[PDB]
């Protein structure tokens, strides 16, 4: 429209409807301008990358996208806190996207003194791959989400892919994606854009825990009507031989029949919190669970959902298997236990198996008068028809969905960080602002123009989703686990600003506290 | 709508219908950016805060708001007048206000010279809470009001406000506001804001004195039919004892019975304005009326409203129990008595007990032939069924309303300051112009970005009120006092403007001339 | 609860367009007198005006649950707040709401102020404190004035040259028009309803 009028208004509340939650959310971007208009090759060769599971080829782009799926942009603590006390499942249904109030300044920097001014006709150009025909980023967990506190004015982040190689060099099949040569949305200072997206329907995220175990399924009142082998030695002595017969019931349960067997397990190393209880050595890299492909060892981080710890021990968690997030103003490298947030998956002790503990036992050899019976232990253990297990859980620092990768064949395609997978997730959505070049020489050249005005662009970002929810039946007497804040004092307020106006999460929040019956 | 085009015009008049006024006024605003754009935790410990009963926690935000409410702001001083001599009562009926004309402006500062430049794509966001869902501040009579002359430009001040603490740190039932949390309209030059309001019933302030008192209700000459107890002494002597009975009539007032009693008394200490009268000594915190609440002693200032002084004795005043005005120019600390303004509560005198005298007398003990009859001083009377009192006088520069904290109980909720109390008064209007960051660098950076464009924005103010009037019916016969300005000469005229083009209030005028039968 | 007290009220940020008196004393030394007054604000609260004060108070006996701090003596009946209708003292069980301790102080409750439930088994006479349980009314510290305090203060007389500033306790307020309180709270244990007496009047007719 127009330079005075204002594109859109901000529109951040949320509304509770009964099946239904709508969280609108609306933020402030700031878009740079990205490796000077140019497509890069970074490649693994341009800086170190001596080790052939570190190498990379792929192409870094001027554009940058917006990446919202994380939980904390969506939610308030608060908003997360009448979700997972009220209900037992939800999933998203409908997504909407808009960017208004655009506003593109240029930079002059000259004898050190720069000054800012405004560009009128410049535009910036802004579109969403519906067709899924780029390389798909945003499912990675990055960095370069909107910001969890609403104040905050926040980066575009860069876009960029990787395409295939050997070592730093490029394969016959790498691909080149011009972002360029996809139709875009070109917006000046009184345009707006938007577009709407339906989530495919996924199965609800299950937000409770187990009030009964999977071994304790059985009524302990009764027996059963099957047996078991009890005795097989008649008593002490030579050629004492006897099979002797029992019913399973309460005295004796864990050899009870019994119709399920917990989920898969890929075994992790444990190591524990406390520090003197941990070997003295490396066994980080070394003493880790990966994934070979190709010839690379990708470390196994969050593999098959598993307990962290077995009872009452916190002291270790798996090596890889956890997620863990850093406190506010953490460090990059090198960072002590203290400062990194390290998460607790204990609510899936009653269907899964502990991820640092053997998923069982098994018979090596045939047993016969000669023979003894010898039994191994088993590692992994990849499916058995009957066996059931619960995904990941969800938190408010950790990512919404992700996108399964298309091919043949896919098991359970739940990703295994956490979220909903998707086979056409919603879109990426890519920006940049149009190069606008310097003063050209009088005399024409064949070159391309290198020089062009520094420049960036701002302006408002409303994502609204609209969510499904499964409520909760509980016929349950006594009271349920909530998540409450702790009442006794302290200096600040937990998810509330610092003195120096710093916005800090203290611990990650979980989503499982009702139960249900297994 | 357009740059060149304005978004409203000034419109200042007040239109005196029969039962009722419009009262319209304009000013203009200057909106600064406030806290860097943070939320900053403010607390007694920042800055000194030894005191237990002065402990505070709360948060400062960068938004700020519109407090149009004291009276001065909607009523010039012929309007005023215009209203209290021809007036018994008035309240609010609507209410209706307006933002239009707004400018941003962008600032540079280098190498000392500053230059103010024109942001025409820069937005200011504004919205009203109309769900009472932030805390109240208006209704504490703080400063940062309309100015009182047409003339004058003001700035807005910075919105914040107070939670529960233990000492300086934070209890858990603190609570945090994040003021981007709420849905705003965001304006460019171009855009105009308004919204209406309309006052829940209140009762009519009531803007008379009363031409009898309390205790004179009574025809002056007829006896009363009930007796009292005149005389329990037979003579002097011994066993001299009797029980006499006399008609209460003219002769002896004071001893009659009556319908009804005056109004609640909680006692302040008397302070004369002549120095030497007063004690030496600081009595000022120690000797003076508090009320604690959780271990805080708060001096309570204007209590139940009560006569100031009794009868021709102005000399002295309650010690916290009177409303002091500045005049103009003002200091902030250790002002001497004659620039401040002391309030005259004395129209009361009817109705209401002295601040500085005790309530009453009770007797203490029972009497017989030993003991002897004992009484002692009531120094507060909470109620008693057939009480009747006056609530504090209006002025023009004291509050026009406040907000009755949302509660079980409260009985008679007129704010002891003055005004009109209600559960919902007219909604907070809160202010911030949007930040607009400099230029970002050009590699992705997780952190939020702390450099911004210094700004501020600039417009006008439209606020009318809708009020309803209680016309004069009075049968009396002799002359009404009124409110004048006194004719003799001067070097300057009261309520305008000085030499220096600066703008005073001479003195403050109450609401009470008319007078009404008690 | 709430979540803001009724004491602080206010913009943290800004000033009062109010006065109070702050210096009565010149200085020290003989005929030393002045009126200084000072803009209420930030730096110094507790002293600024507000509209509105706390519920009405009658003060309770403070005992505490620790045994050692306690008087030795017998205050139980003695020392309880009741009142007297036609010449029987009915002690005062669950007064006006108010709240039960200050601050972090959970040690002590009012005597007879506070709801005391049994636990399952209970005996009937001569319970220990640990098997009866006592209700914790501090969600109201923010309207309400503590049990065991007073109210607040008052003059007792008219200082003059001669005469000193003095001033007494108030141990119960009535009300005052401007109050504001909250009801004492809902419990599982605790009844639903109750029947308000038939007579000419009441006031806030609460349980």
Same mark, same amino acid.
């Given at each position: 429209?127009?330079?005075?009028?204002?594109? +859109?208004?901000?529109?951040?509340?949320?509304?509770?409807?009964?099946?239904?939650?709508?969280?609108?959310?609306?933020?402030?971007?700031?878009?740079?301008?990205?490796?000077? /208009?140019?497509?890069?090759?970074?490649?693994?060769?341009?800086?170190?990358?001596?080790?052939? %599971?570190?190498?990379?080829?792929?192409?870094?782009?001027?554009?940058?996208?917006?990446?919202?799926?994380?939980?904390?942009? /969506?939610?308030?603590?608060?908003?997360?806190?009448?979700?997972?006390?009220?209900?037992?499942?939800?999933?998203?249904?409908?997504?909407?996207?808009?960017?208004?109030?655009?506003?593109?300044?240029?930079?002059?920097?000259?004898?050190?003194?720069?000054?800012?001014?405004?560009?009128?006709?410049?535009?910036?150009?802004?579109?969403?791959?519906?067709?899924?025909?780029?390389?798909?980023?945003?499912?990675?967990?990055?960095?370069?989400?909107?910001?969890?506190?609403?104040?905050?004015?926040? !980066?575009?982040?860069?876009?960029?892919?990787?395409?295939?190689?050997?070592?730093?060099?490029?394969?016959?099949?790498?691909?080149?994606?011009?972002?360029?040569?996809?139709?875009? =949305?070109?917006?000046?200072?009184?345009?707006?854009?938007?577009?709407?997206?339906?989530?495919?329907?996924?199965?609800?995220?299950?937000?409770?825990?187990?009030?009964?175990?999977?071994?304790?399924? !059985?009524?302990?009142?009764?027996?059963?009507?099957?047996?078991?082998?009890?005795?097989?030695?008649?008593?002490? +002595?030579?050629? =004492?031989?006897?099979?002797?017969?029992?019913?399973?019931?309460?005295?004796?349960?864990?050899?009870?029949?019994? *119709?399920?067997?917990?989920?898969?397990?890929?075994? =992790?190393?444990?190591?524990?919190?406390?520090?003197?209880?941990?070997?003295?050595?490396?066994?980080?890299?070394?003493?880790?669970?990966?994934?070979?492909?190709?010839?690379?060892?990708?470390?196994?981080?969050?593999?098959?959902?598993?307990?962290?710890?077995?009872?009452?021990?916190?002291?270790?968690?798996?090596?890889?298997?956890?997620?863990?997030?850093?406190?506010?103003?953490? +460090?990059?490298?090198?960072? %002590?236990?203290?400062?990194? !947030?390290?998460?607790?998956?204990?609510?899936?002790?009653?269907?899964?198996?502990?991820?640092?503990?053997?998923?069982?036992?098994?018979?090596?050899?045939?047993?016969?008068?000669?023979?003894?019976?010898?039994?191994?232990?088993?590692?992994?253990?990849?499916?058995?028809?009957?066996?059931?297990?619960?995904?990941?859980?969800?938190?408010?620092?950790?990512?919404?969905?992700?996108?399964?990768?298309?091919? %043949?064949?896919?098991? /359970?395609?739940?990703?295994?960080?956490?979220?909903?997978? !998707?086979? /056409?997730?919603?879109?990426?959505?890519?920006?940049?602002?149009?190069?606008?070049?310097?003063?050209?020489?009088?005399?024409?050249?064949?070159?391309?123009?290198?020089?062009?005005?520094?420049?960036?662009?701002? +302006?408002?970002?409303?994502?609204?989703?609209?969510?499904?929810?499964?409520?909760?039946?509980?016929?349950?007497?006594?009271?349920?686990?909530?998540?409450?804040?702790?009442?006794?004092?302290?200096? *600040?307020?937990?998810?509330?600003?610092?003195?120096?106006?710093?916005?800090?999460?203290?611990?990650?929040?979980?989503?499982?506290?009702?139960?249900?019956?297994?």
């Amino acid at each position: 429209d127009g330079v005075g009028s204002s594109s +859109g208004n901000w529109h951040c509340d949320s509304q509770w409807l009964g099946d239904r939650v709508i969280t609108t959310s609306t933020r402030t971007w700031a878009l740079p301008t990205y490796n000077n /208009h140019l497509y890069k090759q970074i490649s693994n060769s341009t800086s170190g990358g001596s080790s052939n %599971d570190n190498a990379y080829f792929g192409y870094s782009t001027p554009w940058g996208y917006f990446d919202f799926n994380r939980f904390h942009c /969506h939610f308030s603590p608060r908003d997360w806190q009448r979700l997972i006390n009220n209900n037992w499942g939800f999933r998203p249904k409908r997504l909407n996207f808009k960017l208004f109030n655009i506003q593109v300044k240029e930079v002059t920097d000259n004898n050190g003194v720069k000054t800012i001014a405004n560009n009128l006709t410049s535009t910036v150009q802004v579109f969403t791959d519906s067709d899924y025909q780029l390389p798909y980023v945003l499912g990675s967990a990055h960095e370069g989400c909107l910001p969890p506190f609403p104040a905050d004015v926040f !980066m575009i982040p860069q876009y960029g892919y990787l395409t295939l190689n050997d070592g730093s060099q490029a394969v016959g099949r790498s691909s080149f994606y011009c972002l360029e040569y996809f139709p875009s =949305q070109m917006l000046r200072t009184g345009n707006n854009f938007q577009f709407s997206y339906e989530f495919e329907n996924v199965p609800f995220h299950s937000s409770y825990a187990h009030s009964q175990s999977l071994d304790r399924l !059985m009524n302990p009142l009764i027996d059963q009507y099957l047996y078991y082998l009890s005795k097989t030695i008649n008593g002490s +002595g030579q050629n =004492q031989q006897t099979l002797k017969f029992s019913v399973a019931g309460p005295s004796n349960m864990a050899v009870q029949g019994r *119709n399920y067997i917990p989920g898969p397990s890929y075994r =992790q190393q444990r190591v524990s919190t406390t520090v003197t209880q941990n070997n003295n050595s490396e066994f980080a890299w070394p003493g880790a669970s990966s994934w070979a492909l190709n010839g690379r060892n990708s470390l196994m981080n969050p593999g098959p959902a598993m307990a962290s710890h077995k009872e009452g021990e916190d002291r270790f968690f798996p090596l890889s298997g956890s997620l863990i997030f850093g406190k506010q103003g953490t +460090g990059r490298d090198n960072v %002590d236990a203290d400062k990194v !947030m390290i998460t607790n998956e204990e609510e899936i002790k009653t269907t899964n198996p502990v991820a640092t503990e053997s998923y069982g036992q098994v018979a090596t050899n045939h047993q016969s008068a000669q023979a003894q019976a010898q039994t191994g232990w088993v590692q992994n253990q990849g499916i058995l028809p009957g066996m059931v297990w619960q995904d990941r859980d969800v938190y408010l620092q950790g990512p919404i969905w992700a996108k399964i990768p298309h091919t %043949d064949g896919n098991f /359970h395609p739940s990703p295994l960080m956490g979220g909903f997978g !998707m086979k /056409h997730p919603p879109p990426q959505i890519l920006i940049k602002n149009t190069p606008v070049p310097a003063d050209p020489p009088t005399a024409f050249n064949k070159d391309k123009l290198n020089s062009f005005i520094t420049q960036y662009s701002t +302006g408002q970002v409303s994502v609204e989703i609209e969510w499904e929810l499964q409520k909760e039946n509980s016929k349950r007497w006594n009271p349920e686990i909530q998540y409450t804040s702790n009442y006794y004092k302290s200096n *600040n307020v937990e998810f509330a600003v610092n003195t120096e106006g710093v916005y800090s999460e203290p611990r990650p929040i979980g989503t499982r506290y009702l139960t249900r019956n297994l």
